[PDB]
Design a protein around this ligand. Structure first.
Ligand SMILES: COc1ccc(-c2c(-c3ccnc(NC(C)=O)c3)[nH]c3cccnc23)cn1
Ligand SMILES: [Mg+2]
Length: 295
């Protein structure tokens, strides 16, 4: 029943699991995400999301199967997917300076992926369960060979099920650096689940800024730095982030010279709307995808 897999190299580490490059005898290269028994609930959450036939999309990591693997001293829970050699976006931007064409491809594919995740329908019209990521960041966005993005790392994700209770939506997850000001404030408007989609758009705005910051179309490009890199610790707490994002209304810097390029100007204007203090003022991911198609 178990696939003939040989693990090769540890390539990543997520919040709940380690990620390995592996060989699948058929040999095809695959990614194997390994969850220890104590993170079973996160393995089950990701398995449930990936098992929905309505999720499959070019900008969502291609899922193969889930497995339970007995070890000599316990049991592991695996998820096996396609492997993207270029790896995660944070590392890609750290190592590379990207072109305007690259930024267009990466930014538009990220917006299309989030719009699909949030959608209550498939691209054809069938009802689909909307999903909110809740921990979107450059380190868990994958770069495909054709320089388009694909999403993964759904352990904190929420299926927007009509059965969700108010006492269930209110029980501060995710990466502090990428938390929207209402998340840092514990001020999410729980009267509508649309509040959760708005938090993903904020995090997406920070990632679009990271991509823009490494785009040679502006001319002189600085070495990559995470959003708020010089303002807070390497692993900042919610309090230090709230000092910046909420109290100081702080956002990553957009130097005026970047706006000299017509394309960069449009991207900067769009991502600025997406990181507005007011979640209701942000554009939707679908709006952002449309803005990119207009370029
Ligand atoms: C459902 O199963 C999976 C399996 C792997 C990942 C996954 C990968 C991943 C995927 C494909 N190719 C690569 N390739 C290189 C070079 O890293 C890395 N990177 C991650 C970083 C954080 C969390 N999850 C991941 C996510 N879900
Ligand atoms: Mg635990």
């Amino acid at each position: 029943e178990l696939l003939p897999i040989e693990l090769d190299t540890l390539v990543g580490k997520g919040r709940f699991a380690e990620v390995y490059k592996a060989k699948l005898k058929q040999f095809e290269t695959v990614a194997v995400k390994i969850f220890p028994y104590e993170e079973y609930a996160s393995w089950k959450t990701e398995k449930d999301i990936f098992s929905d036939i309505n999720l499959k999309h070019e900008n969502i990591l291609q899922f193969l199967t889930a497995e339970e693997r007995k070890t000599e001293l316990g049991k592991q829970y695996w998820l096996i997917t396609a492997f993207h050699a270029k790896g995660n976006l944070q590392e890609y931007l750290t190592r590379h300076v990207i072109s305007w064409e690259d930024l267009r491809k990466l930014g538009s594919s990220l917006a299309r992926g989030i719009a699909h995740l949030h959608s209550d329908h498939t691209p054809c019209g069938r009802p689909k369960m909307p999903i909110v990521h809740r921990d979107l960041k450059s380190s868990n966005i994958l770069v495909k060979n054709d320089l388009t993005c694909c999403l993964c790392d759904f352990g904190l994700s929420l299926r927007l099920d009509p059965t969700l209770s108010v006492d269930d939506l209110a029980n501060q997850v995710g990466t502090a650096r990428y938390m929207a000001p209402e998340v840092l404030a514990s001020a999410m408007n729980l009267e509508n689940v649309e509040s959760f989609k708005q938090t993903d758009v904020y995090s997406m705005a920070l990632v679009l800024w990271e991509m823009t910051s490494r785009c040679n179309a502006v001319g002189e490009v600085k070495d990559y730095e995470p959003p708020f890199g010089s303002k807070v610790r390497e692993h900042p707490c919610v309090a230090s982030m709230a000092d910046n994002v909420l109290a100081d209304a702080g956002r990553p810097e957009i130097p005026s010279f970047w706006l000299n390029h017509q394309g960069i100007q449009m991207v900067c204007e769009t991502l600025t709307e997406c990181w507005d203090h007011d979640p209701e003022a942000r554009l939707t991911a679908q709006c952002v995808a449309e803005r990119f198609s207009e370029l």
